[PDB]
Design a protein around this ligand. Sequence first.
Ligand SMILES: [K+]
Ligand SMILES: [K+]
Length: 116
Amino acid sequence: QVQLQESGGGLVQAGGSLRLSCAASGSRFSSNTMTWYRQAPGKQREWVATMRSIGTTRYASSVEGRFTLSRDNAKNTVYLQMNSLKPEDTAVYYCNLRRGGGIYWGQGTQVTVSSH
DNA sequence: GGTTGGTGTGGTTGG
Ligand SMILES: [K+]
Ligand SMILES: [K+]
């Protein structure tokens, strides 16, 4: 069926940059809405970004101008480029994809940003 | 729980 596989998490220094990938199988990103969320240590889950089937993007106020979404249809993969990272960005990052009446989730990947 | 956490039926996300 439908499965999402996230990759790219790890440890980085403040001010650094890294890219998360969300690779889909069983359904195309270009068919539906995909979303990123993050879950920081002492916080509730928060929206990060959305890309619609048509490729249009929206970003949360806490990441706008630093994070950007792109999509490779031939690899059925969506990328979250995370620039100018801050310790406040430390969290588990999730991606999901809608398909029909269901929502399918990646396994989550930890990003840890060390203080300067 | 789930194909996903947890301060679990809200959450730029259903029940
Ligand atoms: K640190
Ligand atoms: K839930």
